[PDB]
Design a protein around this ligand. Structure first.
Ligand SMILES: N[C@@H](Cc1ccccc1)C(=O)O
Ligand SMILES: N[C@@H](Cc1ccccc1)C(=O)O
Lengths: 466, 471
């Protein structure tokens, strides 16, 4: 009989669960990547009440196989090419295991000093791998913190910026604060603006087009800022993207940051996905200008082999955060850097990734995925029925069927491909027209899977065309 | 050489890690409960750069033993009596394992239908164990959702209420919105008010005292609301506590909710810790009146054996949440939990709750709560038998509030010194609070490993330390 806690039961049952998960990974290719169940399928398979008496672990695992797994979209499949990767690694899995086993909640330094200091140290490590400027290192006025997601990271710095303005001019000025970003910016910014009370008409979504590969034009930011200043409004927050979700566009951080600095605009850089690549010198160029940023954000749980959740946020003045987020009327108390109070030992998995793989292995991994994406881009360019929509900079390839009413052949192709169960890809829209995406990021993906995916896409397009 | 992903390497290394964690649990009593290290000790022990080449798992585990574990405050020690428990169970540990192994992110139904539907189902399961009214079941207009923490949950419903008011009266009315709570309410409410733009002067922290056992007096809420209405302010949010962090005080939900309903005040019930106990019929009484609440929150990762993170939030109208938190301009089907929370992504957290519920059973969960409450009752008796101490507030659950009685020796308040000596002994860990301005020591029995032997030993150590301090 299983007890609430017992070291030996934990050992036995944990070995069983380890074997189960390993078997899952060993046969992951046997599942349809995108789940094919119907909405509501699960409530008929499970009781509508918890059991009075315990049920076996074998029964739970059988229910996982037969009831839960059919309803899973396999993010770790070697043929998962959708959205952006959400990496799971052996090192990160071991880190999550250890974090759950320790079971500590580190609000404040005392409730596990190691949980705070290891986080400080590994954020420093990653900042050094990224060649971030000195203002983002813990030894200065700034520092780093692990957030639950890039959405929370942007909310935190937006609140910090808002409050820096409001406690100098008064809360009645909320109606005048303006946020700036390009029309490629992730929806997390709009949601943070809503939560923070920014007025909708003061969310400046600046237009971009193909002439700049959907990168924000600095001159349009300057014009918008000057028109807002003339109108008595207070520009206060700017979000630049390094690797947008749609087409992996990259904004010019230098000129945008010069504008933001000159006008007292908090400068946030969202490199949630592509930031990982910037540990490679041939891609570090793409965050040039970050020295002007007040904050910088990269998702280690995307393309850095660190199991969700692990969003990394650096700021150049931690006081802005803690003055906004503290509730109180020498050492870091991380509750004052985040929305939640409690937090788990999330730095362990990042530390274990860094140690067990090495910067060299992480670089080679980034490069291998980019090489696979370049092979896919080559395959696309050789087929006259397809076209590359925007230049490929990292491991994301945007493409589409060449134009030849009411029906959208690109969506039909994507639906048929995803329904095959052999792979999973997602779509976006650029300048109003649909765009198919192939984002290579799963650790299991090999060139064989990319080749088979291209063959499947070709066969499906040919069948639909006839 | 270790690969980014490999089923057999994962199998071998995961077995090694399972043995490591089991060894930690078997010997957890050998460590000082409260960490005794100095701030900054760790950066001197570790390199200042990530390594160029991989390091062995044995060296990593040895560093965990020798460098990290001393810097750990052992929340799962059977002698951890501080703040409130943050339970770790075999079931919850297995659920965390499976969640990490599958590695899904279910921000939308499509990106793993089971991750959404199992959550709906298990929130329904717990709602039935709590005998929550039907308005909170997923089949109606309301529903349940797993949040990362009670702080996030209260922020979410405060946002929903604020936007519901503002899109009716206009955003310029933000300066008039009033939030109400007692002076025992967790700081999460204040932090949410700050994030949400509530003006500081419009946060009514209403005083409580021993006459009601620090429970909020409804008449004072009524007075505050009438005075605010007469002054042109818009009451819009009320937070009632079921189990305050200080003294496990319980607010009268029925009369407070009567007032809130009558005045259009969003009624939130924070039962973060004590909500668990309410699966027992002898404690369900303490959330009577929740039927008037617009939202209700219980932390499964506190006292319900569900490894962090797992905060359970129920609402009676999911549309409030989704209309406030959705980013779609035209969308008015299926549940997309991104629209119920702050983050976009979310992991498969319903797995650990499902497994706790299935592998233990409601009967075992009830007995577990009751065992912790009985241990707290024994500790209370032990304190009451020592004349140098006193019970400060009645014990309702597994938290005992006590203190050394001040004595005029030829005046002094030893309690902070006693707590510091006890915590520095390393044999146990407890925290303090303040009631009506005077310091109060706390003993919150909540760790799954805690037995009566540990409670007795903790009391004996406290007595010895107080005896040393008195002379
Ligand atoms: N932001 C990604 C989805 C995603 C969310 C969270 C983690 C990983 C991926 C997209 O819109 O394509
Ligand atoms: N309630 C505790 C914080 C806490 C967090 C998580 C678990 C238990 C307790 C406090 O007020 O300090």
């Amino acid at each position: 009989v299983l007890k609430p806690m017992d070291s030996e039961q934990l050992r036995e049952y944990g070995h069983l669960m380890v074997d189960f998960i390993a078997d899952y990974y060993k046969t992951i290719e046997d599942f349809p990547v995108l789940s094919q169940v119907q909405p509501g399928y699960l409530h008929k398979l499970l009781p509508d009440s918890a059991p009075d008496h315990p049920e076996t672990l074998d029964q739970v695992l059988d229910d996982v196989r037969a009831k839960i797994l059919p309803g899973v979209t396999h993010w770790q499949s070697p043929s998962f090419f959708a959205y952006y990767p959400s990496n799971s690694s052996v090192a990160g899995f071991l880190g999550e295991m250890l974090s759950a086993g320790l079971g500590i909640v580190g609000f404040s330094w005392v409730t596990s000093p190691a949980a705070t200091e290891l986080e400080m140290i590994v954020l420093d490590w990653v900042a050094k791998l990224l060649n971030l400027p000195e203002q983002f290192m813990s030894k200065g006025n700034g520092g780093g913190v692990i957030q639950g997601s890039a959405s929370e990271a942007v909310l935190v710095v937006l609140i910090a910026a808002r409050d820096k303005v409001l406690r100098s001019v008064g809360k009645n000025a909320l109606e005048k604060l303006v946020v700036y970003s390009s029309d490629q910016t992730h929806s997390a910014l709009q949601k943070a603006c809503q939560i923070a009370g920014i007025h909708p008409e003061n969310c400046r979504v600046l237009t971009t087009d193909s002439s700049t590969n959907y990168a924000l034009r600095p001159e349009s930011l300057q014009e918008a800022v000057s028109r807002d200043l003339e109108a008595g409004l207070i520009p206060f927050f700017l979000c630049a993207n390094v690797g947008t979700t749609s087409s992996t566009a990259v904004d010019p951080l230098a000129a945008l940051g010069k504008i933001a600095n000159s006008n007292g605009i908090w400068f946030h850089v969202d490199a949630a996905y592509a930031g990982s690549a910037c540990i490679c010198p041939e891609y570090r160029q793409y965050i040039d200008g970050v020295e002007t940023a007040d904050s910088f954000n990269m998702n280690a749980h995307k393309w850095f082999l660190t199991n969700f959740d692990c969003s990394l946020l650096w700021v150049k003045d931690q006081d802005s955060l803690t003055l906004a987020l503290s509730t109180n009327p020498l050492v870091v108390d991380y509750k004052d850097w985040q929305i939640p109070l409690g937090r788990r030992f999330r730095s362990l998995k990042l530390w274990m990734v860094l140690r067990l793989y090495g910067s060299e292995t992480l670089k080679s991994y980034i490069r291998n995925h980019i090489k696979l994406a370049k092979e896919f881009e080559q395959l696309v360019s050789q087929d006259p029925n397809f076209e590359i929509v925007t230049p490929r900079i990292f491991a994301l390839v945007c493409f589409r069927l060449v134009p030849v009413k009411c029906n959208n052949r690109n969506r039909e192709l994507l639906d048929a491909v995803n329904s095959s169960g052999k792979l999973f890809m997602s779509h976006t829209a650029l300048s109003g027209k649909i765009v198919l995406r192939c984002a290579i990021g799963a650790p299991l993906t090999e060139e064989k899977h990319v080749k088979e995916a291209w063959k499947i896409i070709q066969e499906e397009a040919s069948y639909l065309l006839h």
